[PDB]
Amino acid sequence: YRLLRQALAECLGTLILVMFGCGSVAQVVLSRGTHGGFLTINLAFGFAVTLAILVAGQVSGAHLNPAVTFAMCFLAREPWIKLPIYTLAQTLGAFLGAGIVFGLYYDAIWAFAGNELVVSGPNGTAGIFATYPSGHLDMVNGFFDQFIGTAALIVCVLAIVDPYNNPVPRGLEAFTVGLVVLVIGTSMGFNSGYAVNPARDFGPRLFTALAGWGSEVFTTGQNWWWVPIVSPLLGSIGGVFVYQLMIGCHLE
Amino acid sequence: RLLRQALAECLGTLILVMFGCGSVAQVVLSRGTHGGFLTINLAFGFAVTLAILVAGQVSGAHLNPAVTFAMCFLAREPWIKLPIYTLAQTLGAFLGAGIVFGLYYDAIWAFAGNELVVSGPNGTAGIFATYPSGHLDMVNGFFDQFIGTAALIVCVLAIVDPYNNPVPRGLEAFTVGLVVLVIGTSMGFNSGYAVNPARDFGPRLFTALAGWGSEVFTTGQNWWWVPIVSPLLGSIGGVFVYQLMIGCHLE
Amino acid sequence: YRLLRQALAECLGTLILVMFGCGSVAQVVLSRGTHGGFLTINLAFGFAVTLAILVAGQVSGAHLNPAVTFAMCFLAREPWIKLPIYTLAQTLGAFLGAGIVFGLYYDAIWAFAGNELVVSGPNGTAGIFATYPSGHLDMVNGFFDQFIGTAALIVCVLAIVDPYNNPVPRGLEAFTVGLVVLVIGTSMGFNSGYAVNPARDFGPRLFTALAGWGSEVFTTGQNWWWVPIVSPLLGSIGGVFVYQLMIGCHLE
Amino acid sequence: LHIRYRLLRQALAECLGTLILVMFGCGSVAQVVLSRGTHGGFLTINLAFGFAVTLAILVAGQVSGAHLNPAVTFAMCFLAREPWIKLPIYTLAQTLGAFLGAGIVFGLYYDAIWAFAGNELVVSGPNGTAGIFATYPSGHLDMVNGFFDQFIGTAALIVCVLAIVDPYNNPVPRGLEAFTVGLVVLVIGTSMGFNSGYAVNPARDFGPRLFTALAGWGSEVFTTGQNWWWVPIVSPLLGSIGGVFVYQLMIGCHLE
C-alpha cells in the first residue's frame, strides 16, 4: 500500500514539529517571563517545520497541514482520497507529540496552580497545547486573523511547488516554508506558534480534554474550538485564487 | 507581457508590507512587551526574502523603485519599466497597509482612546510610515537614506551581475533579505526597510485617507518628500561606486 | 592507517564545538543576566555544530557524538571497531575544549565566590562545563529528557544521511544538524546546550574534577553523572527503531 | 576605464569589501552604545557583524578572494598559496576602507555622539564613546588576558577558513562559503570576551582607531589601557600561524 507509506511519514512529520514547538511554549509559559519571550516561541516553531519537512519530504511530500493538503486537492495536483488519509495521519501525531510534552513537563504543569489543572486564566496551563481567545482576540477578530494567515501561507507554498517554475533543489525548499511560519507568528496576533495549522490545534486540544483539564477546553471562549479548524480551510481556497490570478494562470 | 510582470510586482510588494508592518504594529501597540527593534528588522528582512521568491521568476523581483531605477540606468531593462513598476510597487504597498489596519483596527483606535493621533506618545501613524525623531530631523535624515540606499544597490548589483558566477535560485533571495536586516540595525531607523520609496509613500497615503487626516503630510516640517528623493539619489550613487571599483573591471 | 586519520578529525571537531559552546555559557553565567539569556546559549551551540561538521565532514564523517556513532554501528553502516576509537577521540577534545575555556575565563571564574570554587548553588561555576540537576530535573525526570532528546536527534540525522534518499549537497547537511541542536535545547528543559552528547558531558566533567572543583562533581545530585551517558545511548536505539519503522524500512 | 592590472583590481575589491563590514558593523555598535540598553543587547552587535562579513565576501569574492582580514592573507601567504607581495597591497587596501567606513559612521551619528557626554568626546569611562570604533580593555581584560583572547580567536578563525578554502576538498558552491565565514565571526564574538564585534581583525581595529585620533577624541586613544593599541594587531598575526599548524597537523597533512 503506497498510501500507507505516506501516512506514516505525515504522522512522524507532525510529531516532530508539535513536540519541538509545543515544548518551547511550555518553557516560556511555565517559567513566567524568564526562560524566553515570544521570539523564541516563533523561532522554535519555524525551525521545527524545516526539520519536519526534511525528514518526510521524499516520502509523502511533507504537507503537515490539512490546509496545504486541501489546496493541492483543490488544484487537482493530488487525488481527493489523499485528504482524509493525510488529515487523520496529521491529527494523530499532534496528539502524540502533545502527549510527549506532557510527559516531560508533568511535574511543572501540575504545580503551576498548586495541584489543580486550570484551562484558562492567569495560571492557565492549557494554553501550552492549543490557542485560546485573548483580550483582543474575539471570534470575529480571530476569524479574520487566521484567514489572512493561511492565505499568505498558501501563496508562498504554491510558488515553490509550482512545476512551471524552475525545480528548487532539495534542502532550500524546506527552509523557505519554515520562514513563512516564523514571519506569520510575528505579524499576526497569535502568540502560540503555527496558529494557521488545523492539525496542530485540534490534536493537542483533544489530548488536553483527556489529560485531566476536563471538557472546559471545548466550551470556553464562546465555543472557540472550531474557529482554528474552519477558518484556515477557507484561507487555503482564497490563497489559491490569489496566486492563480496574479501569477499562476499566466505562467507557461 | 508587461502586464504579467506588473502583476507580480504588486503581489510581491503586498507580501513584504503586510508582513513587515504587522510586526511594527505588535511592538508599538504592546509597548515593550511583544519584542523590540530586533524583531521588527528580522521580520522585514525575512518578508523581503519571501516576496523575492514568489515573484522572482516572473518579473525579476525588484520590489524597490530605487532598484528598478538602477537597473534601467545600466541599460539592463527598458526605461519603460520604471513608471510601470513604480505604480505596481506603490499600489500593493497601499493595499498591504490596508490589511494591517483591518487586523489591528480595534487595537489601533483604543491606543489613544477613540481617536487617531499622528505623532506623540500615543501615535499610531508611525506604524505604516516613518516620521522624524528627536535626532532624526530633515537634514540628518536625508543622509541616512542616501547612504543606506547606496549600500543596498551595491550589494544587489554584485548578486545579479552576469559577469560573476550565476547564483542558485533561492540563495539569491535570502542574501538580498540579509541586506534589509543589516541596514535596519545599522542606520538609525526603527521601522524597517526605510530605504524603499514605495514602501514609504504607499502606506503613508493610506493613513491620510484612513482617518489620520492630512497631518501626516504636514508633520515634521513636511518630511514626507524626503523618503522619496533621497533613495532615488542614493541608487545613482551606488551604481557609480560599484562600477568604478568592481563593475567596469569585471572581465 | 586510515583509522588514525579519522580519529584526529573527530578530536578537532569536538574541540571546536565545546570551546565555542561552553564559552557562551561562561559568558552568560558569569555576567548574571547582563550578556543575554538562553537564546544566545542555544544559538552558539547550534552554530558551533555546523562549523565542526564542515571542518571534519570529509574525513571522519562528522559524527562528533558517541550516541550518533552508536546508531550507525547498530545499523551495520560502520564497523564496530570504529565505536571505541571515535568515542575516545570525541571525549578527548571535549576535555581539551573545556581546558581552553578555563584558561580564557580563569580570573572571572575564581572571582564568582571570592577565591573559592563552588560546584553548585547560587555562586556555582561548575555548571558552565557540565549539566547538573535542578529542582524539577531530578534523576527520574531528567532521565527521560535525555532519552527523548537523543531519539529526536537520531531520527533527524538518519533522515538526511540515508543512502536511498537524494544525496544532500555539502554545506547543507551541516546546517540541518545544527538546527536540531538549537531546537532541542529550546524545547527540552536543559539550559546548558547540546545536553544529548555523552562526550560533551563526560569530557568537561572529567576536567572540572582535576581543575580544582574536586571529586564532588561526581557525588553530587545523588550520583547524577552517569545519567547523561547511559540515557542518550539508549535513546539512539529508540531513535533508530522509530525512523526504521516508519520511513527506514519502507524506502527500497 | 579598464585597470587591466590584476594587482590593482584586487586591491580595489578589498577596499570596498572592508568598507561594507566596518560601516555596517560599527553602526549597530553605535546604536547600542549611544542608546543605553534600549535598542538591543550584545546579540545584535554580533549578529550584524556576522551578516556584514557575509555580504562583504559576496561583493568582492570573485575579484580578490574576499580576505578582508590581514590575518587571513598572512596565513594564505604562509602556506605559499599566494605571493608575499599581496600582503602589503591587501593590508593597505583593507586598512583604507575601514578608515573611510568609520568616517561614514561618525557622520550619521554626529549629533548623538557629541551629546552623549555633553560637549566633549571622552575616550573611555561611563560616558565613553570611543569604544564604538575600537576595542578597549575591560575590568577583567588586562594586557595579558586580552592577548590570549585574540590568539585563540584568530586560531579558531583560520582553522574554519582553511577547511572551506582547502583545494583538496570538494569545491563548496559560491554563496555558501561566504555564509560559513560569517558564522565563525558570529560565534567567536559571542564566545570570547569582546562585546565590540569581529575583534580578531587587525584592519577593523587599527582603521577606525586611527580615524578616532583625528575625529576629535585625540591621541589618548593610543596611550590608554597601558598602550593597548598594538595588541589587536600582533596577537591575531601570531594566532594565524598557530591556526595554520593546528589545521595542517590534524587534517591538512593527511589529505591525499
Curated annotation (Swiss-Prot), chain B:
Function: Aquaglyceroporins form homotetrameric transmembrane channels, with each monomer independently mediating glycerol and water transport across the plasma membrane along their osmotic gradient. Could also be permeable to urea. Also participates in cell permeability to H2O2 and H2O2-mediated signaling. In skin, transports glycerol to the epidermis and stratum corneum, where it maintains hydration, elasticity, and supports lipid biosynthesis for barrier repair. In kidney, contributes to the reabsorption of water, helping the body maintain proper fluid balance.
Motif (NPA 2): 196-198
Residues making up the signal peptide according to the UniProt record: none
Intramembrane residue ranges: 60-73, 192-205
Subunit: Homotetramer; each monomer provides an independent glycerol/water pore. Could also exist in other oligomeric states.
Entry's Gene Ontology molecular function annotations: glycerol channel activity; identical protein binding; polyol transmembrane transporter activity; water channel activity
Activity regulation details: Channel activity is inhibited by mercury ions.
Topology Cytoplasmic: residue spans: 56-59, 74-81, 159-170
GO biological process, one term: cellular response to hypoxia
GO cellular component, one term: cytoplasm
Tagged with keyword Transport: yes
Endoplasmic reticulum listed as a keyword: no
Site feature: Selectivity filter: 44, 193, 199
Motif (NPA 1): 64-66
Subcellular location: Cell membrane; Basolateral cell membrane
Membrane topology: Multi-pass membrane protein
Pfam families for this protein: MIP
Glycosylation sites recorded in the entry for this protein: 122
Regions crossing the membrane: 6-23, 38-55, 82-102, 141-158, 171-187, 224-245
Protein name: Aquaporin-3
Catalysed reaction equations from the record: glycerol(in) = glycerol(out); H2O(in) = H2O(out); urea(in) = urea(out); H2O2(out) = H2O2(in)
Membrane side Extracellular: residue ranges: 24-37, 103-140, 188-191, 206-223
Tissue distribution of the protein: Detected in kidney medulla and papilla, in collecting duct cells. Detected in colon.
